[PDB]
């Protein structure tokens, strides 16, 4: 399996690795229809999402997309440094796919 | 695919923002039947819900509402500030449909 | 809806709210059969329950009866203040209903 | 109702009280097959377990055994001292059927 | 049942302990698909997984994953000293069996 999450977020299409190395500066969360979904930004203007699950997510990813939710509202909480996310970028905001926090 | 809380708010009918920029003053919730629930005062004076799960929600906004409940208690219990909630103004108090959070 | 938790005590029989203004000085918590309960105490001695759940509660409640276990506990590590308790007096420990926290 | 975890504890078969009034001094938790399990230790020696679900426990019994895991990890992590636990010692290490907690 | 977690590693084919007395380094965790993991990493360079539920998988296991990654991420976030780990080392990263916190 992947060591880190550059090496994971190169084994799928339409991604990259944005480099933080910031706490998250704005979290915002929606219970409203269709729009279950969670938005990150930072300082420097950078926003992220959490996609609404959908027909796009199999089955074992529904679990890891409400986890993601609880690491980025806790991240967000504790001022946790965020290193880097690898996000897809076919979708606006771009949408997180994995986090690594450190230092 | 909104970038933001106000964003979002917009594309539902009888929503508005409110601006806090301030921490919750209280929590409160509900085991009660049929008043499973939570309110959040703001020291403004400002009141706000979280529904009871109901008709008017629909499968996916079940998970949501739960998870809403989660954020604002520990919102409430870190002294995080409120930046903006998102609300339905055809309840009373104003029933939240999303929250954002910053310094 | 309610607006706090004075006024949802009133809509139900057998209930009173106590005022406290203070944290948890005990939290108790079962597993054992037939006692999968939280029971907690104040300084001044006053003994509270969440009670195992039964016939007596509809099915909406079963997930906020979980969640008011969770609530209570990080109410307790946390020193938060609890404002009031809405409770059933008809059981002892009196039950209960719904919590408030302000400082 | 019990009012105290001495007096839950004394209504069951193959029970008592270790009264430790410390925090805990170690947190185990295995994901191992027929192993899914907590151990914690005092710095006393003493060691319990939150055993495997078996068929030994009732349904009810099922979510009460997760919430104590999470209990029992949290109070680690924030070195909440343990007033008492209420075990069963017809098994080793003895298996936690109550917790109480108080300063 | 084992009275720590040497003795529980031991009771499995293909496992080694690792003694870290150390704090994470890094988490990163993914809702990719098929790649629903989390990663930690030591100072030293030590990494490990927890690894995609799978067919090597009991079901009792299930929630025990989600568990142990919920622990991790809490551990890494309070800088928790992690004093052993029990592996699978028969993969790469080492697939995480158990966690010991101490000190």
Redesign the interface.
Known sequence: ?????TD??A??HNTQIHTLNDKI????????????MA?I?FKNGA?F?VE??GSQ??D??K???????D?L??????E?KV?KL?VWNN???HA???????N
Chains 1, 2, 3, 4, 5 share one sequence.
């Open positions: 399996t992947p060591q880190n999450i994971l977020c084994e799928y500066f704005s979290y915002t969360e929606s219970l409203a229809g269709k729009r279950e938005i930004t926003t999402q609404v699950p997510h199999i074992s990813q679990k890891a997309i409400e986890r993601m939710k690491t509202r806790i991240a967000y909480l504790t946790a290193e690898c979708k606006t905001p997180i796919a994995a986090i690594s926090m450190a």
